[PDB]
Each structure stands twice: as structure tokens, then as C-alpha cells.
Amino acid sequence: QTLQMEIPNFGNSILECLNEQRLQGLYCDVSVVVKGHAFKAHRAVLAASSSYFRDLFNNSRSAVVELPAAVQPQSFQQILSFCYTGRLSMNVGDQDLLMYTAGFLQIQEIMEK
Amino acid sequence: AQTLQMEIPNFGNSILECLNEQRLQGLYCDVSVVVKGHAFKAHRAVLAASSSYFRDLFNNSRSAVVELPAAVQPQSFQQILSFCYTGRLSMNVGDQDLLMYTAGFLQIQEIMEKGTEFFLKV
């Protein structure tokens, strides 16, 4: 006799809270610095969507990581937001940079087919 | 915050599932919660999203290891931890009282409120 409970779309709700947390700088365990702009985040969430961060966080315990000159802050901001929401916004004029950065950071689900 | 170029449905559902797998392998975890000498790796963020007790505990401390009081049992805790990462709670008839007590202690408010509830599994 098993008793069972199941909350529908639980992950959807939890990731929203994690995004709120990040937006308010709560329970973050890494700071990612891009051209002198610091973004707080959770390693776990970055790792879930990026094989680049997966490999980096597998191999380094530093509290801050700085990305190379490739990555620009606006682009990174969009990618970060994607990792917490599954939404990627449109970028008029810098779609090439955004795509380059997504590829660089090996964001696996951002491109299709 | 205008035009999206992509939107993955049910993204959070899949990501939390990834987070659960990471925990089960000890990856990218930032806290170790110890219960009657049994240590559990976790992510503070995932605990805090579901547990008012943990939110509090993490703000009144600066420590990678947390020890829960002796009133909290390991098997029950494991069930609560899994729930925080899945939204599913499972257990045997005969263990519901202990699980409910543990959920109360850790102030998992999704567990004891209106909405979905426990059932007998098929």
C-alpha cells in the first residue's frame, strides 16, 4: 500500500523561483564576470543548460569566473536568462554575437534540428 | 522583453529533473545536510524554494554543512529531499505520520495545503 502525491508542472514553478532568487541575488554560488560586469548565478542551473559550464564547474571551484573577450555582457545576459526560463529574446543588430556566444558556451537546446 | 526567438515549453520540468540527477551524483551541490550522521548533498536554492525552515537556516549561517536536530529522521528526510526535486512524494502506509511530521518540521508548505493531495498508488 503506497501513498503517492504528485504536483503537476512542479519543475516549471521551481525554476521560476530559482530565477527570482537569482534576480534578487539569493543563494547564488558563482559570479560570472563579463567585460567588468558581474552576474550572480547558480552553477547547477548553468551546468544544466551548458556543457561549457558543466566542464568548467567540474574543474574549478573559484567563486568568480571571467569569460573571454568573445562573450559580451548584453549577450550573456540573454543567455543567462534563457538558462533560467527557456525563453531566448530577439536581438536586433546583435543576433550574430548572441548566436556566437550561445555556441561558445555550448548551450545545447538553443539551436534546433 | 519584446519578441522571443524561442520558448521551450515545460523547460523548468526538464531542468529540475537535471538538477535532481546532479544531486544524485553529488554535482554542483553547495550544501551537505546531515541527519543522524547520514550526509546528503543538495543545492541550497532548491531547498529554499520549498522549505521555509531551510531558507531561514541558510540566512543565519555561513557553512557548507548543516546538521538537523535529532527529531528529524533520515528516511523521512530523504523522502522530503526527493520531493523538493521532483514534486512527487511517495511512502508506505505505516510511514505517513513520520513523513507529515518531517514535512512540518521543514515547513514544506506545498505538502499540507489545499490543492492536490495523497492517494493510494495503483
Side-chain angles (χ1 to χ4, degrees), chain A residues 87-104:
Chain A
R87 303 184 287 272
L88 184 60
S89 69
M90 216 158 160
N91 177 319
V92 187
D94 289 323
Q95 178 77 341
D96 53 8
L97 190 58
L98 174 58
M99 288 299 103
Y100 192 89
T101 304
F104 182 89

Side-chain angles (χ1 to χ4, degrees), chain B residues 1-74 76-122:
Chain B
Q2 170 173 205
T3 303
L4 296 179
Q5 60 175 294
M6 87 161 314
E7 176 170 7
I8 306 174
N10 297 311
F11 190 69
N13 290 345
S14 63
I15 294 302
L16 184 67
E17 200 172 307
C18 187
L19 298 190
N20 198 31
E21 296 164 354
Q22 294 175 0
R23 158 183 85 87
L24 294 172
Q25 280 159 75
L27 300 173
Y28 318 121
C29 292
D30 59 344
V31 64
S32 164
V33 181
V34 177
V35 189
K36 293 214 198 314
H38 303 80
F40 297 85
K41 299 167 175 302
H43 312 90
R44 292 173 176 142
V46 173
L47 291 176
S50 286
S51 168
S52 191
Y53 178 94
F54 278 115
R55 285 210 286 289
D56 189 69
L57 178 50
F58 293 142
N59 305 3
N60 291 231
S61 190
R62 274 271 312 158
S63 160
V65 184
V66 310
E67 296 176 32
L68 301 185
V72 174
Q73 325 265 57
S76 284
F77 178 69
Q78 190 169 245
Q79 288 178 314
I80 294 302
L81 184 59
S82 177
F83 164 87
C84 289
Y85 277 85
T86 66
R88 281 184 264 98
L89 204 39
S90 171
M91 85 215 67
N92 285 321
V93 171
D95 291 330
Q96 69 279 352
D97 288 352
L98 178 52
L99 187 286
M100 292 302 79
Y101 176 95
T102 306
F105 205 104
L106 303 180
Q107 297 180 27
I108 317 291
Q109 164 171 357
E110 200 143 8
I111 281 188
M112 198 57 199
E113 67 163 8
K114 303 298 184 177
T116 35
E117 47 168 306
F118 283 95
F119 299 101
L120 277 68
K121 184 54 162 66
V122 176

Side-chain angles (χ1 to χ4, degrees), chain A:
Chain A
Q1 294 189 39
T2 278
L3 306 165
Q4 174 89 38
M5 178 190 54
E6 179 173 41
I7 299 174
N9 297 306
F10 188 75
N12 288 346
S13 83
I14 297 315
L15 191 67
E16 206 187 356
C17 191
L18 297 187
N19 196 32
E20 282 167 24
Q21 293 176 3
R22 165 190 72 89
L23 288 169
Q24 305 169 31
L26 290 162
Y27 317 128
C28 289
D29 62 344
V30 66
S31 179
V32 185
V33 174
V34 183
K35 296 191 129 40
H37 301 67
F39 298 84
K40 282 170 221 196
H42 311 87
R43 292 167 196 260
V45 173
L46 292 181
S49 287
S50 164
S51 60
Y52 179 101
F53 283 122
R54 190 176 303 117
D55 288 356
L56 178 58
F57 297 145
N58 285 352
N59 297 117
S60 170
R61 272 323 184 148
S62 306
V64 182
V65 289
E66 317 175 45
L67 296 183
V71 196
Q72 308 288 298
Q74 173 158 46
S75 304
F76 181 71
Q77 161 70 263
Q78 290 189 261
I79 290 301
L80 178 62
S81 184
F82 171 82
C83 299
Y84 282 79
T85 64
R87 303 184 287 272
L88 184 60
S89 69
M90 216 158 160
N91 177 319
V92 187
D94 289 323
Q95 178 77 341
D96 53 8
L97 190 58
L98 174 58
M99 288 299 103
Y100 192 89
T101 304
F104 182 89
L105 296 178
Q106 311 174 7
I107 297 130
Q108 39 226 213
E109 308 289 340
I110 259 179
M111 199 69 58
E112 40 161 295
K113 303 171 177 197

